[PDB]
Scaffold this active site. Structure first.
Site, PDB file in Angstrom:
ATOM      1  CG  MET A 162      -2.329   0.439   0.925  1.00  0.00           C
ATOM      2  SD  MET A 162      -3.408  -0.904   0.419  1.00  0.00           S
ATOM      3  CE  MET A 162      -3.837  -1.603   2.005  1.00  0.00           C
ATOM      4  N   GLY A 163       1.802   1.403   0.981  1.00  0.00           N
ATOM      5  CA  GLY A 163       2.631   2.614   1.204  1.00  0.00           C
ATOM      6  C   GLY A 163       2.824   2.899   2.688  1.00  0.00           C
ATOM      7  CD  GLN A 186       8.538  -4.020   5.875  1.00  0.00           C
ATOM      8  OE1 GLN A 186       8.233  -4.749   6.850  1.00  0.00           O
ATOM      9  NE2 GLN A 186       9.722  -4.127   5.186  1.00  0.00           N
ATOM     10  CB  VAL A 187       0.270  -1.405   5.390  1.00  0.00           C
ATOM     11  CG1 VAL A 187       0.074  -0.346   4.331  1.00  0.00           C
ATOM     12  CG2 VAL A 187      -1.065  -1.970   5.823  1.00  0.00           C
ATOM     13  CE  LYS A 204       0.117  -1.750  11.876  1.00  0.00           C
ATOM     14  NZ  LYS A 204       0.681  -1.143  13.108  1.00  0.00           N
ATOM     15  CG  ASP A 228       4.119  14.865  13.338  1.00  0.00           C
ATOM     16  OD1 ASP A 228       3.304  15.719  12.931  1.00  0.00           O
ATOM     17  OD2 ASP A 228       5.343  14.937  13.154  1.00  0.00           O
TER      18      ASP A 228
END
Length: 260
Positions: free
Chosen positions: A24-25, A26-27, A42, A136
């Site tokens: 996806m973007g 380590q998923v 994940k 964040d």
């Protein structure tokens, strides 16, 4: 371990029951072959960085404790092998950062409205039910799907320009299509601008509601002293306006993903 619980229905499962549809973007996007269910996974490598493996484990602990918060991605189950842990999560269509990149400009106030309601309630829930102040809040932490659900990403969900401030900058960036510290060359130059320059408020010429501009002005209150807590933002009229109000996030999202 050994189970996927999806919808209120529990299934027995092992890693081999899942088909890899790619990063996806380590998923991973993975398909549960038994059902057709498409989920996020994940992968935590045992050979991996110990600090960030501890973060994933603390983040998972909080996720597992947040079944009752609709605004946080949920866990379906886990698999443990000799070298890996696979964490099964709710699949979401994209994150706000990718959504801005695809859009190639501003995201409409009505979308950022529903988004702010979801994210402030997630962040309030974390504070008041687990004593977490999330560091964040960035657009990459904000997930949307094509059922119009918005949820907080589970990264850093267990931690003079964080918290309410980071949400303010997230909203300006997404509302304008412009990262306010775009032209800064270093993280240090950025902290210099935050401390020395007037806060980067919403432009006055884009048809933003007073409520939206007020909300952002409040988040970007420079002085720690007078700066609001999630508790108070949760009461802001921007939140009241979009909390109840009807907005077809679903069609808007589909429209966007189809046209890009």
């Amino acid at each position: 371990t050994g189970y996927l619980t999806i919808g209120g229905q529990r299934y027995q499962a092992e890693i081999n029951d899942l088909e890899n549809l790619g990063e996806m973007g380590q998923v991973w996007k993975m398909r549960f072959r038994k059902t057709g269910h498409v989920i996020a996974v994940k992968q935590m490598r045992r050979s991996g960085n110990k600090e960030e493996n501890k973060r994933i484990l603390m983040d998972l602990d909080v996720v597992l404790k947040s079944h009752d918060c609709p605004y946080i991605v949920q866990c379906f189950g886990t698999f443990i092998t000799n070298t890996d842990v696979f964490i099964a999560m709710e699949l979401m269509g994209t994150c706000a950062e990718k959504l801005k990149k695809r859009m190639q400009g501003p995201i409409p106030e009505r979308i950022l409205g529903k988004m702010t309601v979801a994210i402030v309630k997630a962040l309030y829930y974390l504070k008041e039910k687990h004593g977490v102040i999330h560091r964040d809040v960035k657009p990459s932490n904000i997930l949307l799907d094509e059922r119009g659900q918005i949820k907080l990403c589970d990264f850093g969900i267990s931690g003079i320009r964080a918290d309410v401030w980071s949400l303010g900058i997230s909203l300006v960036e997404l509302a304008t299509g412009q990262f306010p510290y775009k032209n800064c060359k270093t993280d240090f130059e950025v902290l210099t601008k935050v401390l020395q320059e007037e806060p980067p408020l919403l432009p006055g010429h884009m048809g933003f509601s007073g409520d939206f501009q007020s909300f952002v002005k409040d988040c970007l209150t420079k002085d720690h002293r007078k700066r609001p807590k999630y508790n108070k933002l949760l009461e802001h009229s921007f939140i009241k306006r979009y909390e109840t109000l009807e907005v077809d996030v679903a069609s808007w999202f589909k429209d966007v993903m189809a046209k890009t």
